[PDB]
Design an enzyme around this catalytic site. Structure first.
Site, PDB file in Angstrom:
ATOM      1  N   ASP B  33       0.803  -1.222   0.000  1.00 48.27           N
ATOM      2  CA  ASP B  33       0.000   0.000   0.000  1.00 48.27           C
ATOM      3  C   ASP B  33       0.837   1.274   0.000  1.00 48.27           C
ATOM      4  O   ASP B  33       0.423   2.286   0.574  1.00 48.27           O
ATOM      5  CB  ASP B  33      -0.951   0.013   1.201  1.00 48.27           C
ATOM      6  CG  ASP B  33      -0.220  -0.044   2.552  1.00 48.27           C
ATOM      7  OD1 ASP B  33       0.670  -0.906   2.746  1.00 48.27           O
ATOM      8  OD2 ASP B  33      -0.522   0.790   3.424  1.00 48.27           O
ATOM      9  N   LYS B 137      -6.377  -0.158   6.659  1.00 55.26           N
ATOM     10  CA  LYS B 137      -5.187   0.162   7.436  1.00 55.26           C
ATOM     11  C   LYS B 137      -5.137   1.657   7.680  1.00 55.26           C
ATOM     12  O   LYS B 137      -5.397   2.445   6.764  1.00 55.26           O
ATOM     13  CB  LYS B 137      -3.881  -0.240   6.711  1.00 55.26           C
ATOM     14  CG  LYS B 137      -2.630  -0.026   7.537  1.00 55.26           C
ATOM     15  CD  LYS B 137      -1.364   0.018   6.679  1.00 55.26           C
ATOM     16  CE  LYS B 137      -0.893   1.449   6.439  1.00 55.26           C
ATOM     17  NZ  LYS B 137       0.599   1.561   6.314  1.00 55.26           N
ATOM     18  N   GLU B 178      -2.863   0.478  13.541  1.00 55.24           N
ATOM     19  CA  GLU B 178      -1.398   0.527  13.510  1.00 55.24           C
ATOM     20  C   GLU B 178      -0.865   1.729  14.275  1.00 55.24           C
ATOM     21  O   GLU B 178      -0.696   2.821  13.703  1.00 55.24           O
ATOM     22  CB  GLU B 178      -0.867   0.549  12.090  1.00 55.24           C
ATOM     23  CG  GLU B 178       0.656   0.746  12.041  1.00 55.24           C
ATOM     24  CD  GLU B 178       1.181   0.736  10.614  1.00 55.24           C
ATOM     25  OE1 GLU B 178       0.357   0.606   9.690  1.00 55.24           O
ATOM     26  OE2 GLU B 178       2.407   0.840  10.415  1.00 55.24           O
ATOM     27  N   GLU B 180       2.385   2.819  15.329  1.00 55.37           N
ATOM     28  CA  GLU B 180       3.788   2.489  15.140  1.00 55.37           C
ATOM     29  C   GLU B 180       4.656   3.380  16.010  1.00 55.37           C
ATOM     30  O   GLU B 180       4.637   4.610  15.884  1.00 55.37           O
ATOM     31  CB  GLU B 180       4.222   2.628  13.683  1.00 55.37           C
ATOM     32  CG  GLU B 180       5.742   2.452  13.554  1.00 55.37           C
ATOM     33  CD  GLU B 180       6.229   2.336  12.131  1.00 55.37           C
ATOM     34  OE1 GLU B 180       5.408   2.475  11.199  1.00 55.37           O
ATOM     35  OE2 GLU B 180       7.450   2.105  11.954  1.00 55.37           O
ATOM     36  N   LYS B 220      -1.670  -3.790  14.440  1.00 52.56           N
ATOM     37  CA  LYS B 220      -0.414  -3.823  13.701  1.00 52.56           C
ATOM     38  C   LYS B 220       0.588  -3.004  14.499  1.00 52.56           C
ATOM     39  O   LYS B 220       0.755  -1.801  14.266  1.00 52.56           O
ATOM     40  CB  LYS B 220      -0.618  -3.317  12.268  1.00 52.56           C
ATOM     41  CG  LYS B 220       0.626  -3.207  11.447  1.00 52.56           C
ATOM     42  CD  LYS B 220       0.350  -3.041   9.973  1.00 52.56           C
ATOM     43  CE  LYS B 220       1.665  -2.892   9.225  1.00 52.56           C
ATOM     44  NZ  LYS B 220       1.522  -2.798   7.748  1.00 52.56           N
ATOM     45  N   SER B 291       2.493  -8.371   8.779  1.00 53.13           N
ATOM     46  CA  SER B 291       1.933  -7.430   7.793  1.00 53.13           C
ATOM     47  C   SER B 291       3.132  -6.672   7.211  1.00 53.13           C
ATOM     48  O   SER B 291       3.414  -5.529   7.588  1.00 53.13           O
ATOM     49  CB  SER B 291       0.896  -6.481   8.396  1.00 53.13           C
ATOM     50  OG  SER B 291       0.451  -5.587   7.389  1.00 53.13           O
ATOM     51  N   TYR B 334      11.717  -8.793  32.581  1.00 48.37           N
ATOM     52  CA  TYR B 334      11.022  -7.948  31.624  1.00 48.37           C
ATOM     53  C   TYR B 334       9.829  -7.273  32.302  1.00 48.37           C
ATOM     54  O   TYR B 334       9.202  -7.870  33.161  1.00 48.37           O
ATOM     55  CB  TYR B 334      10.572  -8.782  30.425  1.00 48.37           C
ATOM     56  CG  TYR B 334      11.710  -9.371  29.647  1.00 48.37           C
ATOM     57  CD1 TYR B 334      12.522 -10.377  30.183  1.00 48.37           C
ATOM     58  CD2 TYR B 334      11.981  -8.925  28.374  1.00 48.37           C
ATOM     59  CE1 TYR B 334      13.588 -10.896  29.450  1.00 48.37           C
ATOM     60  CE2 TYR B 334      13.019  -9.425  27.652  1.00 48.37           C
ATOM     61  CZ  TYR B 334      13.815 -10.416  28.180  1.00 48.37           C
ATOM     62  OH  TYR B 334      14.841 -10.899  27.415  1.00 48.37           O
TER      63      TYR B 334
END
EC number: 4.1.2.13
Lengths: 335, 334, 324, 325
Positions: B33, B137, B178, B180, B220, B291, B334
Site C-alpha cells: 500500500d 489500514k 497501527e 507504530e 499492527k 503485515s 522484563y
C-alpha cells in the site's frame, strides 16, 4: 510536562490583538456563514443577500466587530467590484470564515455527533489568512437527553475543537470555539446549567492539553435556558444569572470574549437576555457580546431590509454594554 | 454507561469472520500500500510491479491471507484484464485498503504528529467495500525521545485510531489499528517495551471509549526492539520475550490477531524475529503473524522476482507458526 | 513516558510466584474476611467458627490455594495452640488479609461510593507481610442504575484500587483487585456485560497509569448475570458466555488469575456457573476460579466441616470444567 | 451528566460567606499549622509561641482574616483560660485546621509524592466544625525536574485534593486547595509558569469532576518564580506578570480567593511580590492575598517579638491591596 512553545510572542500579540478587535466594547459578530443548504436559491440571490447585509449604512460600523462568512461568500464581490472581505474591513470589521465540514454520527451513541473538517485544514487556513480572514468558526453540537451528552460525545467534541483551535492559531487565525448545547428537550434551567458547566470544563481542559493560547481565542456558547419543551417560564434575570454562573465556574479570565449564539431565540429575546447577562451583579472578566445569525437577520425593498438589520445591530450593540431597553432561593446561592 | 448498540449480531459475525480469515494459521498480510511518493515512477511501472507481486504462482496462496493496496491499485487491472481485487480473491486473499491521509504535526510538541483522513471516511469505506475491500489500514507514528511520546501525542493518536476503527466497522470493514513506535533514537530494549506498553494501554482504553468491537479488529504494532542508534546487540530471544510481554500486558484476548510491521529489519531478521515470537513460552491468545511491506518485497526478469517474493512469503508462513529456520535472563527481568 | 522501575526482578518473581500459587489448577480462595459487623456475636464464637473452616480435614488442601482473613482473625489461634496463619500455611494455603476500611459516599452522586483505607496502608502491609500474609484484598462497590455507575464513580474507584495495588506490591503483597458491580436492579444480562466491560477497562487503564505489575495481581469480579429483579430467564451457558466475553474484551493475558465473587448466588449455582465458565469454548488465558464466602460457608463440628469440604471439592472440580 | 446536587442553597451560602470573610479586602491568613515535627520543643513552649502570635495587639485585627492551626493548638488555651479558637474569633478571625496527614511516595516515579489523610476525614471535619473551625488546609507537593511532575503525579494529586474538597464542603468547611510546586532546581521563570499552568488546569478539571462548589473554596498556590538555582535574574514585575498570567489561564472567576504561599521567600520579598502581583494591570477577578507562615513569623521579650509579627501583618495587609512601598 516540558514545553516546546507553540507560538512566538509576535504570533501571540497578533492573535490577542485580533480577538480584542472583534469584541471591543459595543461590538459583536454578524454570523452570515450559512451553507448553500442552510441558506435555502441561486448564487446571485445569495450574493445579493450577503451584499445587502454587508453594505448597510455606517451606523453599523461601531456595532459589528466581525463577520463570519461561508467559503463561497468569501470569494464574491459587491456590485462596485470590491471583494466582500474588503467591504467588511473598510467598515471597521474583521473577516471570519466557517471552516468545519458538518457533523457526523458517533457509533454506539443515541444519535450523537462529532464534527469533521480537520483534513488539510492547515492549508485551508493559510489560504484564508492570505485572502483576508483573521478568525474562524467551528461548530460542535451536543444534545441533552436521558443519557446524553455522553462521556464519549463530550470528550470527542472537546478534543476536535482543541485540534481545530491549534491549527488555526498556527496560521494567524483566531479560533472561535463553539460547543453548542442544543435547546431541544424538556429539561429545566438547572439541568442546562449543569450540562453547560460540565461541557465547558471538558473544553478548557482539552484546550489546555492541546496547548491553546486562550487570549487568542473566543468562546461561542449557548446561553443557559430551559429546554424548548419545558413549560416552566423563566425570567430574563434567571437566564442571566444561570448563564453568568456557569461561565464564571468554567471559563478562565484569560479568554478574551464570549460571543453568545442565539439558538431559537427571537431577535428581541436574544437582545434582552444579552442585556440581562451584562447587568448581572457578579464579576465577569470577559467581554459578553453576540455572534448572531438569524437573530440579526430575520426582520431583514433593499433599503427597508437594511434598516431592519441596522436596528438589530444597534440594539445588540447596546445590550452587550448593559444599555438596552425594549429570598435565599432567588439569590445567586440558588445556582 | 448506557448502551446504544453500535453493531448487530450479523454485522459482528461478518467482521469477526473477515478478521479470522486474514490471520488464519500460516497466513499473513502483504502490505503493498505504498503511496506514489513512497513508491519512489510511472503508473504503468507501478501497475506492472504490483501485478508482479499479485500474480505469483499458487504456492503463495496458503501464505497470504490478505493484501493491503494503495488507492490507485484497487482500481487497476492485470494484463489479462482481471481487476487486482479479483486476482487476490481468486488466490484466497482478502483485499485491504489504506485509508489514512498521512501525518500532520501537533503544535506545541517536539515535532510529534497525529494522522489525518477522517473527513468523508465513512463514504470512502462504503465505496471501498463496494469495490471489493474487506479490511483497512490506518497508520499513526510515535517517536521515542527525551520527552516523547508526550501525553498529548499518545492521547490524540489513540483517539483518532478509535474514530477510524468505529467508522470502518459501521461499514463492514475490519480495521487494522497501527500505532507504530518508530525505531529511531538511541533507547534500549527496556525503554521500547515500556513505551509500547504505555501506548497500547492508551489505544485499548480509546477503543473501549469509542465502543469498538475488538474481535473484528487487528492490531499492527512494532516489535519491541532497541533503537537504531543503540549499539547493544539484543538476541532474537530477547526481542521475542519483550514483544510478547508488552503485548500480554495490554492487548485483550478478544483481539483476533496481531500483524507486526517490520520497520527497518532485514527480510531475514523479520522472519527470524517473527518465528521467535511464536516460540515464546508464554500464553499468547491471539494470532501472531506478519503485515510486511519491504520485508516481503526487497529481494523481489518477471519470474526470478516473483520467485524471491514467493520464498519470503513461504518463510514467513512458517515463521508465523514457529516452524521457521533459515534471574536476569528469565521472564521476570522484563 | 519515562520509567523509574517500581519493582526489581527479585520482587516481581516473588509476586508472580505468590499469585500462581493461589490460583494453581484446581484451587481457589476461601473468603473468610467478614468484618465483625458483617459476621453478626462474641470474640470466642468468631474464633471458633473461623477455626471450624480453617482446620477442616486435609481433603480440602488441594482445593484451597488461599484464605482471606479479617484483621482480628490473623492474630487468633486454633485450639491446638497454633496461629491461624500457621494453620493455613501447613495445609498448603497462602494467607490473605482484607485491608480496606469500608465504603464512603461520593457527594454529588446517586448514593455512589468510593472506598477508604489508604492512610498508613504501606506500614500496615509491611506488618501483615511479617505476620504471615502474602496477598491482600480491597473491595470497591458499583451499582447499576438509571445514571450509575457514573464517570466519577468509575474513575475514582479505578484510581483507589490502583493506589492500593501499588502500595501492596511495594511490600511484597499480591493485591486482589475487586471491582464489584452489584446485582441490584432489574437490568438484563447484556446491560451487566456492558457495564462490566466499561468498568474493567477503566480499572486496567488505571492500573497501567499507576505502573502496576499485572502478573503479580489477581482480579475478583462479579460474574456477568441478570439483575436480581430481572424478569428474563437466562441459562448457565449464557451467563458463562457473557462473563467470559466481557473478560476477554478487557483483561490482559498477563493477569495471573480471575477469582470470581459469588454475589447472591446459591452454593450450587455458583459452582454450576463457574463450571460453565471454564467450559466456555473460547480462549481464556488466565485461571478462572473462585473467591467464595457464603458460597463455601452457608451450609456450614465434623458434620459442618464436611459440608464445607464438599463445596470446596465441588468448586475445585468447577474451576477445571470437571463438575457434574 | 445527571445532577444529584451535592449542596443546598443554605450550604452554599454558608461556605461562600466563610470564604469571603477570610479574604476580605486587606486581609490574609496566618499559617500557624506546623506539626510538632516541623515546629522543632515542649507542649508548653509550643502553646506559648502560638499564644504570642494569636494574642498580639488589636492592630492586627484588620490584617488577619483567618488563622490555620495544627490539631494540637485548636484544643489549647491562652493564659487567661480562653480556647485559642475563641481568641482568634474575638479578634475577627476565621479559624482553620490542617487536615492532611503528610505526603507518601508514588511507586514507579522519580521520588514524586501524593498526600494521604482521606480516611475518616468526614468524621474529622464534622468535629472540627463543632469545635470552632470553619476552613481547612490540605497540602500536595510537586517537583519540577527533567521528567517531573509526571502525568501520574499531576492526575493523582489533583484527584486527592478534589476528594478532600468534596468531604470538607459536605461538612460546612471551606477547603483551601494547596497544590504546591516546589522552587527546587535551576529551571527558569517560564518553565515554572508552564508547569503551574498545566497543574492548575488538572486541579480545576478534577474539582469539576468531583462536583466542587468553587465559590466555597480558596486556592493556595506557589507564586511563579525562577527555580532556586536558576542563573537568570528576574524582576518582581516579571514574577508578578508570570504569576498573574498563569492564574488567569487556569482559575475560574468563581473561585473566591487565592492565598499565596511564601515558599522560601524572605519576609520582605514576599510582601514586595504580593504587592507587585496586586499591581499587575490585567483583570484579576479573585482576591490575591497571603497565606504566610515563615513570611509572617521569622522576625517574631513577648512584646518585642509580637511587634515584629504585627509589622509583617501590616505590611502584607497593604500588599494584598497593592498599597505597599
Amino acid at each position: 510536562p516540558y514545553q516546546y512553545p507553540a507560538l512566538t510572542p509576535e504570533q501571540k500579540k497578533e492573535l490577542s490583538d485580533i480577538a480584542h478587535r472583534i469584541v471591543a466594547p459595543g461590538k459583536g459578530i454578524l454570523a452570515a456563514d450559512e451553507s448553500t443548504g442552510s441558506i435555502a436559491n441561486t448564487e446571485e440571490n445569495r450574493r445579493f443577500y450577503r451584499q445587502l447585509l454587508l453594505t448597510a449604512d455606517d451606523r453599523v460600523n461601531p456595532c459589528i466587530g466581525g463577520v463570519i462568512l461561508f467559503h463561497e461568500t468569501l470569494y464574491q464581490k459587491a456590485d462596485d467590484g470590491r471583494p466582500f472581505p474588503q467591504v467588511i474591513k473598510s467598515k471597521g470589521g474583521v473577516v471570519g470564515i466557517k471552516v468545519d465540514k458538518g457533523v457526523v454520527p458517533l457509533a454506539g451513541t443515541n444519535g450523537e455527533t462529532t464534527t469533521q473538517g480537520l483534513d488539510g485544514l492547515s492549508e485551508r487556513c493559510a489560504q484564508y489568512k492570505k485572502d483576508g480572514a483573521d478568525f474562524a468558526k467551528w461548530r460542535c453540537v451536543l444534545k441533552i437527553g436521558e443519557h446524553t451528552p455522553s462521556a464519549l460525545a463530550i470528550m470527542e467534541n472537546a478534543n476536535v475543537l482543541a485540534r481545530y483551535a491549534s491549527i488555526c492559531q498556527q496560521n494567524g487565525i483566531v479560533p472561535i470555539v463553539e460547543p453548542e448545547i442544543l435547546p431541544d428537550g424538556d429539561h429545566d434551567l438547572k439541568r442546562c446549567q449543569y450540562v453547560t458547566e460540565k461541557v465547558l470544563a471538558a473544553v478548557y481542559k482539552a484546550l489546555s492539553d492541546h496547548h491553546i493560547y486562550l487570549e487568542g481565542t473566543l468562546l461561542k456558547p449557548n446561553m443557559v435556558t430551559p429546554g424548548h419543551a419545558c413549560t416552566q417560564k423563566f425570567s430574563h434575570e434567571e437566564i442571566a444569572m444561570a448563564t453568568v454562573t456557569a461561565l464564571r465556574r468554567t471559563v478562565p479570565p484569560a479568554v478574551t470574549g464570549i460571543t453568545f449564539l442565539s439558538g431559537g431565540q427571537s431577535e428581541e429575546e436574544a437582545s434582552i437576555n444579552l442585556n440581562a447577562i451584562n447587568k448581572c451583579p457578579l464579576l465577569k472578566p470577559w467581554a459578553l457580546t453576540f455572534s448572531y445569525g438569524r437573530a440579526l437577520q430575520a426582520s431583514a425593498n433593499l433599503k427597508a431590509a437594511q434598516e431592519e438589520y441596522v436596528k438589530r445591530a444597534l440594539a445588540n450593540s447596546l445590550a452587550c454594554q448593559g444599555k438596552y431597553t425594549p429570598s435565599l432561593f432567588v439569590s445567586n446561592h440558588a445556582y
